[PDB]
Write a protein that binds this ligand. Structure first.
Ligand SMILES: CN1C(=N)N[C@@](c2cccc(-c3cncc(Cl)c3)c2)(C2CC2)C1=O
Length: 390
């Protein structure tokens, strides 16, 4: 482990997001910021909100610069409005550098902030193409690399606890690591396997095969990437295109058929509970996603367990049962490898070499009989045809 200052610098959980401490302004104002590989703006609460106990106060920063421009950002599940500016930003448990970065000061929002998430803003780590209002607003990581000697790479180890964390526990627990500018070997086991970044906008990848307990889903591989496949720390679930979700759920139901679960469970809405310690992990299948490799006609696979795709939740009766929600859900905007999938792996966002690496995480949840895996190589032909073009 060569990056001790950054190891264990994240907190949070898949349902509410993982965040890192940052400072903004002069004197520094401390804020907790969601790590989001699915967006490209650095946007922070800058006005009072019922769900915020702190926010960025521009009038108190001597280094604040107003860009005299507003930004309106609507999402599917919420929206916000803000004022653009720049200021000096640092990451206390990070590289020992301070940079001048763009900041969207959020003045109005709807369904954006989460009660009890403990974060006050978002750090969009994806590329300028998807920055708001347009690609001229340089994202944070691009500023960091341009202004310093930090290598153009970061890596994420998101650590799911494997059980519910109450309000106090989630604040006191280590949620993982964000290594800025490097790869920390203590965070994974086995080898790192890399898949190309198809295009630099989201962190887009190409899935070439899907198995449920070794059984090929057998769909045209273009379906797996319709209309894109991305790696997104800012989505909780593994999200699959509608037709892929329908085929995968049918296969997961068949593999787990010795127990019948209600429709609401498969819809990711209702929890399922078992007596303490008796969760029947073994009846649920493993899921393997094969990704395009860096060598021609070569792929590798990542394998996740039900300990990743069943998200621990507290029972409505705060009982002693062990309860979960199904964290695989349908999408109309492509595959999203969200936080519950990332919790199985150490993920290297190697921007310098336009590739994403995966290795088994040293903090993935498993049982005595099965573990997550990253394995290869496999011979896979015509992988380019798996990518979707509009
Ligand atoms: C899909 N997605 C992102 N990748 N980030 C967003 C976001 C915004 C606010 C909160 C969360 C969030 C909430 N709960 C759990 C998580 Cl993991 C993330 C995500 C948005 C900027 C585009 C969002 O909707």
């Amino acid at each position: 482990g060569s990056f001790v200052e950054m190891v264990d610098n994240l907190r949070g959980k898949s349902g509410q997001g993982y965040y890192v401490e940052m400072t903004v302004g002069s004197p520094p104002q401390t804020l907790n910021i969601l790590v989001d590989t699915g967006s490209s703006n650095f946007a922070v609460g800058a006005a009072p909100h019922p769900f915020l106990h702190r926010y960025y106060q521009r009038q108190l920063s001597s280094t604040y610069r107003d860009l005299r421009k507003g930004v309106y950002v609507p999402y599917t599940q919420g929206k916000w409005e803000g004022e653009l500016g720049t200021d000096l930003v640092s990451i206390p448990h990070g590289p020992n550098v301070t940079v001048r970065a763009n900041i969207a000061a959020i003045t109005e929002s709807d369904k954006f902030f989460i009660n009890g998430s403990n974060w006050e803003g978002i750090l969009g780590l994806a590329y300028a193409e998807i920055a708001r209002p347009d690609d001229s607003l340089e994202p944070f990581f691009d500023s960091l690399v341009k202004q310093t000697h930090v290598p153009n790479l970061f890596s994420l180890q998101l650590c799911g606890a494997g059980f519910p964390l109450n309000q106090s526990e989630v604040l006191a627990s280590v949620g993982g690591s964000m290594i800025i500018g490097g790869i920390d070997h203590s965070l994974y086991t086995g080898s790192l396997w890399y898949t190309p970044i198809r295009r630099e906008w989201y962190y887009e990848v190409i899935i070439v095969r899907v198995e449920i307990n070794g059984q090929d889903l057998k769909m045209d591989c273009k379906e797996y990437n319709y209309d894109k496949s991305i790696v997104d720390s800012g989505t909780t679930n593994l999200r699959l295109p509608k037709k892929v979700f329908e085929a995968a759920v049918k296969s997961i139901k068949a593999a787990s058929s010795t127990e019948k679960f209600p429709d609401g469970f498969w819809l990711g809405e209702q929890l399922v509970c078992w007596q303490a310690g008796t969760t029947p992990w073994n009846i649920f299948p493993v899921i393997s996603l094969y990704l395009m490799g860096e060598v021609t006609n070569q792929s590798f696979r990542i394998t996740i367990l039900p300990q990743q795709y069943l998200r621990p939740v507290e029972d409505v009766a705060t009982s002693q049962d062990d309860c979960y929600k199904f964290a695989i859900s349908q999408s109309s905007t492509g595959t999203v490898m969200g936080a519950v999938i990332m919790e199985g792996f150490y993920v290297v966002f190697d921007r310098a070499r336009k590739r994403i690496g995966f290795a088994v995480s040293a903090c993935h949840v498993h049982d005595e009989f099965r573990t997550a895996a990253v394995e290869g190589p496999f011979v896979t032909l015509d992988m380019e045809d798996c990518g979707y073009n509009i």
